[PDB]
From Swiss-Prot, chain A:
The calcium release channel activity resides in the C-terminal region while the remaining part of the protein constitutes the 'foot' structure spanning the junctional gap between the sarcoplasmic reticulum (SR) and the T-tubule. Pore opening is mediated via the cytoplasmic calcium-binding domains that mediate a small rotation of the channel-forming transmembrane regions that then leads to channel opening. Homotetramer. Can also form heterotetramers with RYR2. Identified in a complex composed of RYR1, PDE4D, PKA, FKBP1A and protein phosphatase 1 (PP1). Repeated very high-level exercise decreases interaction with PDE4D and protein phosphatase 1 (PP1). Interacts with CALM; CALM with bound calcium inhibits the RYR1 channel activity. Interacts with S100A1. Interacts with FKBP1A; this stabilizes the closed conformation of the channel. Interacts with CACNA1S; interaction with CACNA1S is important for activation of the RYR1 channel. Interacts with CACNB1. Cytosolic calcium-activated calcium channel that mediates the release of Ca(2+) from the sarcoplasmic reticulum into the cytosol and thereby plays a key role in triggering muscle contraction following depolarization of T-tubules. Repeated very high-level exercise increases the open probability of the channel and leads to Ca(2+) leaking into the cytoplasm. Can also mediate the release of Ca(2+) from intracellular stores in neurons, and may thereby promote prolonged Ca(2+) signaling in the brain. Required for normal embryonic development of muscle fibers and skeletal muscle. Coiled coil: none annotated. The chain holds residues 1172 to 1219 of 5037 of the full protein. This is Ryanodine receptor 1. It is found in: Sarcoplasmic reticulum membrane. Signal peptide: none annotated.
From Swiss-Prot, chain B:
Cytosolic calcium-activated calcium channel that mediates the release of Ca(2+) from the sarcoplasmic reticulum into the cytosol and thereby plays a key role in triggering muscle contraction following depolarization of T-tubules. Repeated very high-level exercise increases the open probability of the channel and leads to Ca(2+) leaking into the cytoplasm. Can also mediate the release of Ca(2+) from intracellular stores in neurons, and may thereby promote prolonged Ca(2+) signaling in the brain. Required for normal embryonic development of muscle fibers and skeletal muscle. The N-terminus is blocked. Channel activity is modulated by phosphorylation. Belongs to the ryanodine receptor (TC 1.A.3.1) family. RYR1 subfamily. Binding of [3H]ryanodine indicates that the heterozygous channel is activated by Ca(2+) concentrations 4-fold lower than normal. Single-cell analysis of cotransfected cells shows a significantly increased resting cytoplasmic Ca(2+) level and a significantly reduced luminal Ca(2+) level. It comes from Oryctolagus cuniculus. Detected in skeletal muscle (at protein level). Fast- or slow-twitch skeletal muscle. It is found in: Sarcoplasmic reticulum membrane. The calcium release channel activity resides in the C-terminal region while the remaining part of the protein constitutes the 'foot' structure spanning the junctional gap between the sarcoplasmic reticulum (SR) and the T-tubule. Pore opening is mediated via the cytoplasmic calcium-binding domains that mediate a small rotation of the channel-forming transmembrane regions that then leads to channel opening. Sequence repeats lie at residues 202-298, 299-397. Homotetramer. Can also form heterotetramers with RYR2. Identified in a complex composed of RYR1, PDE4D, PKA, FKBP1A and protein phosphatase 1 (PP1). Repeated very high-level exercise decreases interaction with PDE4D and protein phosphatase 1 (PP1). Interacts with CALM; CALM with bound calcium inhibits the RYR1 channel activity. Interacts with S100A1. Interacts with FKBP1A; this stabilizes the closed conformation of the channel. Interacts with CACNA1S; interaction with CACNA1S is important for activation of the RYR1 channel. Interacts with CACNB1. This is Ryanodine receptor 1. Changing L311G: Decreases protein stability.
Amino acid sequence: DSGSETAFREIEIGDGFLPVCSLGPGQVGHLNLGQDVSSLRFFAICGL
Amino acid sequence: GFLPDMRAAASLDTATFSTTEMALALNRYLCLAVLPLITKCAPLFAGTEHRAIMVDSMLHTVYRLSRGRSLTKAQRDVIEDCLMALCRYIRPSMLQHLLRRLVFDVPILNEFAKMPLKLLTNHYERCWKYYCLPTGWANFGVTSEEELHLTRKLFWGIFDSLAHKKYDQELYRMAMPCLCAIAGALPPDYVDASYSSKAEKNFDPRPVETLNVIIPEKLDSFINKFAEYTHEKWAFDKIQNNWSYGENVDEELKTHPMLRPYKTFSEKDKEIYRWPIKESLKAMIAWEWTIEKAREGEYNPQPPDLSGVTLSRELQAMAEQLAENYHNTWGRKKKQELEAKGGGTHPLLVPYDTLTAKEKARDREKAQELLKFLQMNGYAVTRLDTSSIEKRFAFGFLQQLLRWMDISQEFIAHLEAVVSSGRVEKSPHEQEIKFFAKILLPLINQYFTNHCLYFLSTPAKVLGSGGHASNKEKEMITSLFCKLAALVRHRVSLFGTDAPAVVNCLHILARSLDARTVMKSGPEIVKAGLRSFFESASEDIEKMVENLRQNLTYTTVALLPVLTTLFQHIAQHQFGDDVILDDVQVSCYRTLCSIYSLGTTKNTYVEKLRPALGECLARLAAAMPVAFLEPQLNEYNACSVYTTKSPRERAILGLPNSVEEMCPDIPVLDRLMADIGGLAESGARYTEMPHVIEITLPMLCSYLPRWWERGPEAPPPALPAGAPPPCTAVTSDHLNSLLGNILRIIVNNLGIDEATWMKRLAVFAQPIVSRARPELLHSHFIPTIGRLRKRAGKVVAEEEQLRLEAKAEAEEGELLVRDEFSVLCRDLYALYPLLIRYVDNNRAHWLTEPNANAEELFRMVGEIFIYWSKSHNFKREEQNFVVQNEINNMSFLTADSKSVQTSLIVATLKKMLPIGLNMCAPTDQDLIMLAKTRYALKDTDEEVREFLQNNLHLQGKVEGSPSLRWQMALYRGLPGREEDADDPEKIVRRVQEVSAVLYHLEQTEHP
């Protein structure tokens, strides 16, 4: 709303971080952690 | 010790003991030792919910100490500061008793009543989400029904008290924030259970006089039967409570001590328990309620009397009035004993419509039981219909605004009459005028600002936290808007001091309005008034255009901004088809012809007002639902007047059966394109032709987007709907040409000093520059930016020469090149937003497939950023230009639609940075860092190229790291990438450019 690019900031490192996804009833979704850049899409846009 | 001693002081407050020497000693002791400690510990006073019990009494005694007499103003200030600091760090949960006790003194509006309103406004400003939002605010929770009722009553009490009281500058100024805070806190759609307005009245409940009037005894067979049946049902309550009836007096038996069967039941209690029933029935018949016996007939009661069944609403309302009579009689008989002391009041000594249901339950149950006893036997008693929508707070508030509005129109008509004939100072309604001006306008302004979302929401589309507003509310809001429009139509000259407030309120009320539901099945009076509003506005615009060749001040001050915001809101909410039609269509079309007829005029007035008209007609084009231009296909459009009306109805509306004839002044859309392209090719300057740039360019930039989606280029989702030819046949080539023409104009006119409208033209073209053809880069981006960089480098060279020479002439030349840098900043800030749009739109394609033109533009903007970073003159003149023209606002707008200095880095080294970053191989990063080290040693461009040539072998190895493994894999897997980039010359060029980019970027971050 304020225009900040980053969703969050100043996050403490602590123990660490892990990818996570939660889905409701009747909802399907594909998760690509990035095992292969060939299957990884939109990587070269921002991530790379 | 502390609390007992301050109890003692609050008790000695009495005027008899107020002058006692040790009473003043206690006052000084408290105000000098105890109270400051409480203020200091107030931040820690937070929470304490567990100990709120003492906190309550402690709040009460601090308030009573502030209320104490025989106290110095300094001591009063200390106690008030303690109250304020305490309430600042206290959960709103335990503050209900304080507010309830304050309700006695809040609407008195005495001298001593000012600090209560200050505390109330601070409390409600702190707790805003606690009342409006049903969601619990933190762990404090949500407002209670009693709290919402209390704040409603307090709001209305201040409203009425301050309306009746004569104007006082101090009272008005300090009390209006309190009313604004209460209005913001109270939800618009609150529906109190006891919405009926008693309109009466410390608290002295007057009973009903019924002993003087003779009580009819024609229904004594019912009166005595019910009198004994009350005691019989009491015995039934005992047996349901599982207690038998006792014969003799006994304290262990909570049941009636002489409750005996009718065989052994003495009549001494029977002939004395009937009196309450007598009182109730006598009061019932004393009120206008005639009772008729429709029927004619007639130790535990076999027939059961209950109260859990439903009953008619009006009869239950009469029973509610009788329960109110019960409660107020109880209050009178209690306050007769309580008034002997003169200090304090019973906790339940509140009006019946004010008390909550839990304490109402006893009287309500008694009344309902008596009513059921009437109902089953069949006694017909005969002598309002308020719905929940009427019970809503917004409905009553709007009704009050309409009432004070008719009063306002009356006394402003009187003001106009007296100012026209001489000058009358002492107006008979001066208090009303000052109230309506000073407090009423800020109140509605703030209330509508904080509850704009609620009124704008529809039942189908829940827009905001609030669900929706009723259609009747949505039409009274429009009626109020049009009525204040009617007032400002003539009386703008009057109350010129308050005129800014009037126009701000008009701007606010132009929003949060569903004009769609206003027109569709809306009230005829409101619709006709609003239609007459557009008609009057159009005739006024005609009056101004004829005058250019009181209305002048009215138009410029109020009509153009407010009604321009009107079209802006219409375009935002897609009201064009619903609002602009029939007579509204005719009026806005006439406004368009009048506003375009001013092209011939070239006087100072039209030149200075031309930007305002440009904004207004841009809004006309945005909100206008028919293709005024390219009118050969206007028949296909349903919203056109020709389509809506039959030929005869067109004749009666004034249509000459020729769409082109009403406005031949504006040529066709195609012609526009030809004219603007020709002017761009000839390089016509802003001074050479102001009218086209200031007027027709808004036509293009607002016409093309709105009708592009419904045009042939964007296929309609509904094929049957799109089967008729589109009314507007614009394609992507139209917009492209328009943008090119605009840019051609920008590149042609760049040395014109004080070309202020460059920035506004950039603003209007900022939406239209997107959805652009890819070839526009090589068309008109690299050449313009290259010419700009040549100019910037020339001025930087002059600055460098002028700083290497040292003299007063050098300082004067430094000032001159500072002015030159300022005009450079103006031009570059004008050019950048369209560049930002273009690079954002085309970035993904450029990253996926490399583009040499994009790389050249990257080098160009990089060199420009190098110039800006190295030149302090550029930075300071950018600061001056930003602060002078408020271009920081425009920069933020561009940023959010993609700091003060960030316009020089987002367009050079932030958005387009990856374009230049991808040229270098992932294995050249070693050379890039080494070049950065050279820059850290401050080595020139040729010299860093030399070290790249010597240390080309210092490059990384693909085998060196797995990161480099997959990075090189991706780099060679890029489709547009080739092996020709391995040339050492290309490597050193790209490494030097990227390294300089990064070095100067980090220098900008930290010198």
